Amino acid sequence: EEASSTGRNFNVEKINGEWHTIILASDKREKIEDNGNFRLFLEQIHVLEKSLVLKFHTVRDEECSELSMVADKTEKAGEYSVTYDGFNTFTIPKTDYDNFLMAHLINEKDGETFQLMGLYGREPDLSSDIKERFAQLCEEHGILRENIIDLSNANRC
Ligand SMILES: CCCCCCCCO
Protein backbone atom coordinates (compact mmCIF):
# COMPACT_ATOMS: atom_id res chain seq x y z
CA GLU A 1 0.00 0.00 0.00
CA GLU A 2 1.07 3.58 -0.69
CA ALA A 3 0.06 6.57 1.34
CA SER A 4 0.43 10.29 1.77
CA SER A 5 1.12 11.87 5.17
CA THR A 6 -1.96 14.09 4.64
CA GLY A 7 -4.12 11.07 3.80
CA ARG A 8 -6.58 9.27 6.08
CA ASN A 9 -4.86 5.89 6.13
CA PHE A 10 -1.35 7.33 6.87
CA ASN A 11 0.62 5.33 9.44
CA VAL A 12 3.50 7.55 10.53
CA GLU A 13 5.16 4.81 12.55
CA LYS A 14 5.87 2.90 9.39
CA ILE A 15 8.33 5.56 8.16
CA ASN A 16 10.42 5.02 11.27
CA GLY A 17 14.01 3.85 10.72
CA GLU A 18 16.73 3.69 8.11
CA TRP A 19 16.50 5.93 5.03
CA HIS A 20 18.99 7.28 2.46
CA THR A 21 18.84 10.37 0.24
CA ILE A 22 18.46 9.05 -3.29
CA ILE A 23 17.49 12.16 -5.29
CA LEU A 24 16.97 15.83 -4.38
CA ALA A 25 15.14 18.45 -6.46
CA SER A 26 14.39 22.13 -6.11
CA ASP A 27 13.09 25.07 -8.06
CA LYS A 28 16.26 26.90 -6.71
CA ARG A 29 18.97 24.46 -7.82
CA GLU A 30 21.83 26.08 -5.91
CA LYS A 31 20.26 25.00 -2.59
CA ILE A 32 21.03 21.34 -3.37
CA GLU A 33 24.22 21.70 -5.42
CA ASP A 34 27.66 20.89 -4.01
CA ASN A 35 27.75 23.41 -1.22
CA GLY A 36 24.03 24.05 -0.77
CA ASN A 37 22.59 23.94 2.76
CA PHE A 38 19.86 21.58 1.57
CA ARG A 39 22.04 18.87 0.07
CA LEU A 40 21.28 16.68 3.11
CA PHE A 41 21.94 12.94 3.21
CA LEU A 42 19.24 11.42 5.35
CA GLU A 43 20.30 8.54 7.63
CA GLN A 44 17.24 7.89 9.77
CA ILE A 45 13.88 9.02 10.97
CA HIS A 46 12.79 8.53 14.53
CA VAL A 47 9.07 8.76 14.94
CA LEU A 48 7.91 10.26 18.20
CA GLU A 49 4.52 11.19 19.57
CA LYS A 50 4.28 14.67 17.99
CA SER A 51 7.55 15.04 16.10
CA LEU A 52 10.14 13.33 13.90
CA VAL A 53 13.80 13.33 14.71
CA LEU A 54 15.76 13.54 11.49
CA LYS A 55 19.42 12.50 11.31
CA PHE A 56 21.43 13.61 8.30
CA HIS A 57 25.01 14.18 7.35
CA THR A 58 26.42 16.87 5.06
CA VAL A 59 29.58 16.84 2.97
CA ARG A 60 32.27 19.54 2.61
CA ASP A 61 35.55 19.02 0.74
CA GLU A 62 34.91 15.28 1.04
CA GLU A 63 34.35 15.34 4.80
CA CYS A 64 31.07 14.26 6.42
CA SER A 65 29.55 16.00 9.44
CA GLU A 66 26.45 14.88 11.31
CA LEU A 67 23.36 16.94 11.99
CA SER A 68 19.99 16.31 13.58
CA MET A 69 16.74 18.24 13.45
CA VAL A 70 13.43 17.91 15.17
CA ALA A 71 10.38 18.38 12.99
CA ASP A 72 7.14 19.10 14.83
CA LYS A 73 3.62 18.34 13.72
CA THR A 74 1.86 21.57 12.72
CA GLU A 75 -1.93 22.02 12.80
CA LYS A 76 -2.40 20.31 9.42
CA ALA A 77 -2.37 16.51 9.65
CA GLY A 78 0.58 15.11 7.75
CA GLU A 79 2.53 18.39 7.90
CA TYR A 80 5.69 19.12 9.91
CA SER A 81 7.78 22.21 10.46
CA VAL A 82 11.42 22.74 11.27
CA THR A 83 13.80 25.65 11.64
CA TYR A 84 16.88 25.18 9.49
CA ASP A 85 18.33 27.93 7.27
CA GLY A 86 14.95 29.67 7.54
CA PHE A 87 11.51 28.26 8.36
CA ASN A 88 10.45 25.02 6.67
CA THR A 89 7.23 23.05 6.41
CA PHE A 90 6.98 19.68 4.63
CA THR A 91 4.62 16.76 3.92
CA ILE A 92 5.16 13.28 2.43
CA PRO A 93 2.94 13.17 -0.68
CA LYS A 94 3.91 9.54 -1.30
CA THR A 95 5.62 6.63 0.43
CA ASP A 96 5.18 2.85 0.36
CA TYR A 97 6.98 2.56 3.72
CA ASP A 98 9.15 -0.42 2.61
CA ASN A 99 11.05 1.07 -0.32
CA PHE A 100 10.65 4.78 -0.88
CA LEU A 101 9.50 8.02 0.61
CA MET A 102 8.94 11.26 -1.35
CA ALA A 103 8.87 14.53 0.57
CA HIS A 104 7.81 18.02 -0.54
CA LEU A 105 9.22 20.94 1.46
CA ILE A 106 8.65 24.69 1.46
CA ASN A 107 11.50 26.86 2.80
CA GLU A 108 11.08 30.52 3.75
CA LYS A 109 14.16 32.71 4.38
CA ASP A 110 14.65 36.48 4.27
CA GLY A 111 11.18 37.01 2.92
CA GLU A 112 11.71 34.59 0.01
CA THR A 113 10.74 30.99 -0.66
CA PHE A 114 11.61 27.88 -2.62
CA GLN A 115 10.45 24.27 -3.07
CA LEU A 116 12.55 21.20 -2.36
CA MET A 117 11.53 17.62 -3.15
CA GLY A 118 13.35 14.58 -1.94
CA LEU A 119 13.33 10.87 -2.81
CA TYR A 120 14.58 8.63 0.02
CA GLY A 121 14.98 4.87 -0.05
CA ARG A 122 15.31 2.12 2.53
CA GLU A 123 18.47 0.94 0.65
CA PRO A 124 21.19 3.27 -0.76
CA ASP A 125 19.51 3.27 -4.20
CA LEU A 126 16.08 2.69 -5.77
CA SER A 127 14.82 1.29 -9.06
CA SER A 128 14.69 3.41 -12.18
CA ASP A 129 10.87 2.96 -12.13
CA ILE A 130 10.64 4.61 -8.69
CA LYS A 131 13.03 7.33 -9.88
CA GLU A 132 10.77 8.04 -12.87
CA ARG A 133 7.69 8.18 -10.60
CA PHE A 134 9.64 10.78 -8.58
CA ALA A 135 10.43 12.80 -11.75
CA GLN A 136 6.66 12.87 -12.52
CA LEU A 137 5.85 14.15 -9.00
CA CYS A 138 8.47 16.88 -9.46
CA GLU A 139 6.86 17.87 -12.77
CA GLU A 140 3.46 18.22 -10.99
CA HIS A 141 5.15 20.82 -8.76
CA GLY A 142 6.71 22.84 -11.55
CA ILE A 143 10.21 21.40 -11.05
CA LEU A 144 12.14 20.64 -14.26
CA ARG A 145 14.17 17.44 -14.55
CA GLU A 146 17.30 19.54 -15.02
CA ASN A 147 16.69 20.66 -11.42
CA ILE A 148 16.54 17.05 -10.17
CA ILE A 149 19.87 15.70 -8.90
CA ASP A 150 20.44 11.95 -8.38
CA LEU A 151 22.79 11.55 -5.40
CA SER A 152 22.81 7.76 -5.18
CA ASN A 153 26.51 7.63 -6.13
CA ALA A 154 27.47 10.13 -3.41
CA ASN A 155 25.29 9.43 -0.33
CA ARG A 156 27.69 7.24 1.63
CA CYS A 157 30.62 8.65 3.64
C1 LIG B 1 11.38 13.26 6.11
C2 LIG B 1 12.43 14.19 5.49
C3 LIG B 1 11.76 15.33 4.72
C4 LIG B 1 12.74 16.01 3.77
C5 LIG B 1 13.74 16.93 4.48
C6 LIG B 1 14.83 17.37 3.50
C7 LIG B 1 15.65 18.54 4.06
C8 LIG B 1 17.02 18.66 3.39
O1 LIG B 1 16.89 18.67 1.96
Swiss-Prot record:
Q: Among the record's GO biological process terms, what is one?
A: positive regulation of phosphatidylinositol 3-kinase/protein kinase B signal transduction
State the UniProt keywords alphabetically.
Answer: Disulfide bond, Pheromone-binding, Secreted, Signal, Transport
List cystine links. Answer: 64-157
* One GO CC term on file: nucleus
Cellular location of this protein?
Secreted
Give the principal location in a single coarse category. secreted
Cite the SUPFAM superfamilies for this sequence: Lipocalins
- Organ and tissue specificity: Abundant in the urine of adult male mice but absent from that of females.
> A Gene Ontology MF term for this entry?
insulin receptor activity
Specify whether Secreted is a keyword of the entry: yes
Q: Which Pfam families match?
A: Lipocalin
Purpose? Binds pheromones that are released from drying urine of males. These pheromones affect the sexual behavior of females.
Q: What is this protein called?
A: Major urinary protein 2
Gene from which the chain derives: Mup2
